[PDB]
Design a protein around this ligand. Sequence first.
Ligand SMILES: [Zn+2]
Length: 113
Amino acid sequence: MEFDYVICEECGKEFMDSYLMNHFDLPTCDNCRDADDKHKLITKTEAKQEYLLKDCDLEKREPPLKFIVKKNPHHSQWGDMKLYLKLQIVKRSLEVWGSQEALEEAKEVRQEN
Ligand SMILES: [Zn+2]
C-alpha cells in the first residue's frame, strides 16, 4: 500500500519509489537506473526476434519479467503495445540460446527455416 524504505541496490538511497519501483517493483532509484541501455526497456516483439525467446523468460519466467506499455513510434500497434524489463530479457536470453555470439547463430536458425 505504501513504501517509505525502498533502498536503491546501486546507490543505497532510502526513498518511497522511483521509475522502476513505480511499476516494475524494482528496488532502485531513477538516479542509478540507466534507461540508455541497462534499464532501457525492450519491446516484447523485440525480445522475440532479437532473443528468439519463446514462452519462457518472456511470459513464463514467473514472474514473466515485469512488462509495461507505450506507443512504438514505428509502424506497429502503438495503441496498446507492451514492453519488458530489457536487462532482464537480456540476461535470460544469454541463458536461453547460450549468450550473445550464440544469440546471433540463433537469429540465423530462425532466418534459415
Ligand atoms: Zn540508486
